[PDB]
Amino acid sequence: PPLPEYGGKVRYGLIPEEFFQFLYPKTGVTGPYVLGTGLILYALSKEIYVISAETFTALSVLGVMVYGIKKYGPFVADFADKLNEQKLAQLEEAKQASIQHIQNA
Amino acid sequence: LATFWYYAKVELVPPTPAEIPRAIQSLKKIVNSAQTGSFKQLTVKEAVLNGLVATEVLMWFYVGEIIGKRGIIGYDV
Amino acid sequence: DIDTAAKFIGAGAATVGVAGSGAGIGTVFGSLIIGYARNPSLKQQLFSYAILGFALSEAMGLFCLMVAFLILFAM
Amino acid sequence: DIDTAAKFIGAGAATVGVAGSGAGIGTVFGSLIIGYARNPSLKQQLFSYAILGFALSEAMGLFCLMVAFLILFAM
Amino acid sequence: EVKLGELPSWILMRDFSPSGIFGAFQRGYYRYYNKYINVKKGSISGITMVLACYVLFSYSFSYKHLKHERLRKY
Amino acid sequence: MPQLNTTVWPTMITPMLLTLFLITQLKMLNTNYHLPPSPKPMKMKNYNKPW
Amino acid sequence: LQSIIKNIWIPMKPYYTKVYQEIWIGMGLMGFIVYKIRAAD
Amino acid sequence: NLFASFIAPTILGLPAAVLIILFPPLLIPTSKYLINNRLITTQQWLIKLTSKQMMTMHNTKGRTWSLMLVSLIIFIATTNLLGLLPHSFTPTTQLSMNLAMAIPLWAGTVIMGFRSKIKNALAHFLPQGTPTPLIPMLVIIETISLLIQPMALAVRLTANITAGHLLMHLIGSATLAMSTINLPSTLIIFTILILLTILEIAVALIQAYVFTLLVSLYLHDNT
Amino acid sequence: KARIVEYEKEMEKMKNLIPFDQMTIEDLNEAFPETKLDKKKYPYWPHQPIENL
């Protein structure tokens, strides 16, 4: 069976567009944003997310990962795509050759 | 960048004096819905969505008290 | 007491022994630089022997380090 | 007491002596990298001499380590 | 399914077997897989989202060690 | 060191035994690299005729 | 009792039976070591 | 208060180390197709490459362990690379798991060299080109050497993750401590932390590959 | 002549191959039986010489 041509329309690599479209009718476009900022401020205000060393090691690893993606991402993307295209073309030039074989026989 | 303030000034304003009549009338509406028992006739979707908007405005209360204390994490004292 | 004191001293002494692994890793990768600039077509075999030597150097270094952590936090 | 304290100190000091084996193994495998990049057709004899040198280096390192464990846990 | 039922009857109709819970988990796995990963020309998110939920789980069980470090006292 | 609380060791060993000797190996055994298609256009030995 | 032997044991038989024999001897050694360790505490 | 990240985890009184250890395989999906998604494309390329690297140097009796060695390196590398996420319990930092990954494989390959290979195996206990006058205790070295092989293996990992992790942790502390004193000093400590994190990624991958390669060498020497 | 139309049957088969982005490894093996991994000379994964791997 074939495979769909795309994934799931995620935003900021963390949130799928389904959530934005799901909150838009009853909060508008800034609704998800205001909900997120309010939840953030309540989380780090009532000390349910303790700011500690882990906060800064997390900021480090997240900066590293976002830069790693935004730099070496398209390269890996088109590399996987080229792997696929090479395999496909090799198989097709492997079909043609056997057709030619049988016709020559 | 600039559409941030566009959205702020276009949706999230304090109610204009001409609106809190509409606000009081719609609060009359919803607590009338409470007095009748119409809330029980509400299904999953807008129930959880009203819960979400309540969470949002409660976050707004917490933001209000943090701007009260002029500090964010706990009390500066 | 005297025991915690000597445990601190012994942990410092034990951890001194990483210096050898530091220098051994330095030598391994310096040699690797040289061997690469000498025949830059055995890169994979050179690098394999590199990882192997580094692994043994780190084996000794971590022996020293765990001894520090054994006499310090365990014994 | 004073005896357990000095045993900890002596164990740390004794374990310092692994640094030499760490550096010696580093040198052995760095040389091996070089000698391979120099004549990559004696791989088996080079690697045999490699294991031999590493074995003697580890002989000294484990001498030091057992002395640590002898003065620490046995004496 | 849920998101169309609104009665407790449903929870009394759904199985609660060992085989049942395993089947539910497996169906969930395959739904997420076929939705976000198993599509050609896919994107990275299908991985980072699992990573983020992993971080959330590992945080919430690493919380009892963090409440003993809260910056304030109230 | 918590690494030495030797009353929590089994619960660290056994799921590793599973995930390393059973689950990862099954995840690999389903990864197979087919040999490349070698369509030899030259396979014809019929014969001449009896003459 | 089914599938546990159809997707779990028939692909691993060539390894669990013939290739990983000394691996199991080593696992016995490791189990004895761990028993002796946790016992001496 | 400091080794908390290595304390055996639990949630709601349940042993959540199980869900942690069994998770890495869930990150390697598999398929019967021929032209599949980007994820499995890249993962199969990586496994193909790793197999070519590890197993080329073996005869067939060694190459029988191809599945074992590649699964080993994949499991260890995913575990380590999952360790770098914040507030995450890295099960390789435990001495238990590493001893259980080390003693089985090494003991297995030594006994495999002992079942077959028996004259060969008892002879490699001695470098033959050695002169006579101290052939004897030379093999004492070797024998001792041999029995230190497994422990080393386990140790060789348990630290270079554990230490590494602690290491980053402390600079976190450090920068947090300087978060309120001198902003540029905070910035440069943060930069040290960034470079450190990069080094930690690299050393996770390297330690996985190294554990694998050393088990591989013991194999090749005992087949 | 028997061989003629045998060959032409085979050519119609190879001409009626499902596109490759739908084919499973089993079907590719059935349609190119040279790609069948020799599970006799190589009984253990990856079921081929590591050089070709």
Side-chain angles (χ1 to χ4, degrees), chain A residues 5-6 13 45-48, chain E residues 39-41 48 59 71 74:
Chain A
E5 207 67 52
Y6 281 115
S45 177
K46 280 299 179 297
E47 289 287 75
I48 205 61
Chain E
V39 293
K40 83 196 192 189
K41 212 164 59 156
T48 79
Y59 178 100
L71 183 63
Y74 304 141

Side-chain angles (χ1 to χ4, degrees), chain D residues 13-60:
Chain D
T15 191
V16 178
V18 192
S21 284
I25 280 172
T27 288
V28 170
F29 277 72
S31 82
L32 178 71
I33 281 181
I34 275 176
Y36 185 81
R38 171 62 182 181
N39 188 4
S41 47
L42 299 159
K43 171 159 135 186
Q44 54 75 2
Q45 274 272 111
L46 297 203
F47 193 80
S48 172
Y49 277 167
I51 308 177
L52 182 51
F54 155 87
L56 294 170
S57 303
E58 272 313 275
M60 305 328 289

Side-chain angles (χ1 to χ4, degrees), chain E residues 29 33 37-43 47 50-51 54-55 57-62 64-66, chain H residues 4 7 9-11 16 19-20 23 26-27 29-30 37-40 82 85-89:
Chain E
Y29 172 32
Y33 184 23
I37 291 295
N38 187 4
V39 293
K40 83 196 192 189
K41 212 164 59 156
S43 201
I47 279 298
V50 161
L51 256 52
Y54 179 70
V55 169
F57 167 76
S58 87
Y59 178 100
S60 60
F61 70 73
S62 156
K64 67 184 73 66
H65 291 164
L66 286 183
Chain H
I7 286 179
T10 184
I11 170 174
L19 292 174
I20 296 170
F23 181 83
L26 196 70
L27 287 177
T30 57
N37 44 60
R38 281 153 150 175
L39 175 70
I40 310 159
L82 281 193
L85 304 164
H87 318 78
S88 299
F89 162 68

Side-chain angles (χ1 to χ4, degrees), chain A residues 73-85:
Chain A
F75 164 63
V76 183
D78 67 60
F79 171 88
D81 274 334
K82 278 312 288 295
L83 261 180
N84 263 342
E85 301 319 307

